[PDB]
DNA sequence: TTTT
């Protein structure tokens, strides 16, 4: 069957700067009466996606010229020639014949400087405690670029089990991300240790960002 | 103008099935393949299948055979899918798009989607706990809204008025329940000087909680 | 021409 190769997966640009994301076919997609249903569509994230390029090269009705679309066969590219903040989102080739087939998606997302996060670590409620539960989170704002690894210890051993990771959006202001690392143990459990360890590994330091606290 | 509205969130249970709906409007509805798209929640886009209304005649992709029907009420200018055996897999929005015929040949018309939850939890009401600062001009507190279900809640500081600063990152399942969490950055001046609240509402269980957050 |  017929795959279809996006790359990149993330594509990080300053607004103004160009934009070139590419598709390949595992195999020549060209239809028996000679014509190429190859498509373009962008998805801004909680809307339907919208048609940007038909038939490898030709713009929809509507799209700014600023779109263009080419290739031939196995290989195809969408360039944009100037980066709006409308036109950040994810965007999806897709083979219109035989079988249709969606690319995996490139989503173009809003290139910054590096920004080391800034972490916070939160000891468990008393009202959670009360109830037999134990959640320690760990909060990491404000970095740049997303890629980031956070290891929980206990007492000095690491714990990879009860741990839950969320990631925000990249920043609509700021253009950084944050996200959210919680480990959940049982009241019996956390009390039975003393240290709570959350660190960082990010690009913008050489050693791992570390936030601990002992409960005693 | 062509419109294709598509029926309601569906929230189902394993097992069972669920029949969605995608009322087609501004063109002749029989003349055209309307084709079913599959979007599992932050993931890409997959083809499920196509009927061509006039001749009820369908196509599939092999994973959706035997899983996903596509019906058509051409009186109601109505397509129809029922999607059987829901297992967690099958949560994700659903989108009906008419593919073009002359000039265009792509698929220039989407519906707004389906969102269909498949989950055997039943309502229940969050727990929120209140993140205070381990026992720097700024103190970052945080909420934590643990064990809840179904989406969504909604999450407010000072019931609006602490805009700034702030960061809910996205509701994650753990185990067929959400949590979510969310932290706000304010000057060392602010608090514990002054009062901040965490505020809570989750509409299916018909709760508000207010959540002050109080040093240790 | 697409939905082979
Ligand atoms: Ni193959």
């Known amino acids: 069957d017929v795959l279809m190769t996006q790359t990149p997966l993330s594509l990080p640009v300053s607004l103004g700067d160009q934009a070139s994301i590419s598709c390949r076919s595992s195999?020549?997609?060209?239809?028996?009466?000679?014509?190429?249903?190859l498509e373009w569509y962008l998805q801004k994230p909680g809307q339907s996606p919208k048609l940007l390029i038909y038939?490898?090269?030709n713009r929809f009705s509507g799209v700014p010229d600023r779109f263009s679309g080419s290739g031939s066969g196995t290989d195809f590219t969408l360039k944009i020639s100037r980066v709006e903040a409308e036109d950040l989102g994810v965007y999806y080739c897709?083979?219109?014949?035989?079988?249709?087939?969606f690319g995996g998606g490139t989503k173009l997302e809003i290139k910054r400087a590096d920004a080391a996060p800034t972490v916070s670590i939160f000891p468990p409620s008393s009202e959670q405690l009360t109830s037999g539960g134990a959640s320690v989170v760990c909060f990491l704002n404000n970095f740049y670029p997303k890629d980031i690894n956070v290891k929980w210890k206990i007492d000095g051993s690491e714990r990879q089990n009860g741990v839950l990771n969320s990631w925000t959006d990249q920043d609509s202001k700021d253009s950084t991300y944050s996200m959210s690392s919680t480990l959940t143990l049982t009241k019996d459990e956390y009390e039975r240790h003393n240290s709570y360890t959350c660190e960082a590994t990010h690009k913008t330091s050489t050693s791992p960002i570390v936030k601990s606290f002992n409960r005693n | 103008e062509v419109q294709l509205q598509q029926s309601g969130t569906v929230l189902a249970r394993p097992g069972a099935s669920v029949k969605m709906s995608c009322k087609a409007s501004?063109?002749?509805?029989?003349?055209?393949?309307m084709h079913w798209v599959k979007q599992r929640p932050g993931q890409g886009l997959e083809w499920i299948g196509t009927?061509?209304?006039?001749?009820?005649?369908?196509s599939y992709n092999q994973k959706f055979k035997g899983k996903a029907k596509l019906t058509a009420v051409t009186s109601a200018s109505t397509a129809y899918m029922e999607v059987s055996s829901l297992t967690n897999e099958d949560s994700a929005v659903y989108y009906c798009?008419?593919?073009?015929?002359?000039?265009?040949?792509?698929?220039?018309?989407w519906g707004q989607g389906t969102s269909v939850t498949v989950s055997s939890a039943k309502t229940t009401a969050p727990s929120v706990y209140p993140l205070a600062p381990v026992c720097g001009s700024s103190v970052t507190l945080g909420c934590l809204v643990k064990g809840y279900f179904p989406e969504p809640v909604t999450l407010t500081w000072n019931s609006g008025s602490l805009s700034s600063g702030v960061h809910t990152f996205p509701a994650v399942l753990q185990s067929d329940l959400y949590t979510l969490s969310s932290s706000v950055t304010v000057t060392s001046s602010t608090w514990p000087s002054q009062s901040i609240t965490c505020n809570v509402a989750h509409p299916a269980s018909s709760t508000k909680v207010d959540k002050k957050i109080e040093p240790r």
């Open positions: 798009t008419r593919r073009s015929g002359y000039k265009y040949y792509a698929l220039d018309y």
């Open positions: 501004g063109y002749s509805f029989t003349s055209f393949w």
């Open positions: 009927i061509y209304p006039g001749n009820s005649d369908t």
């Open positions: 195999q020549s997609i060209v239809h028996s009466n000679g014509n190429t249903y």
């Open positions: 038939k490898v090269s």
């Open positions: 897709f083979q219109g014949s035989l079988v249709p087939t």
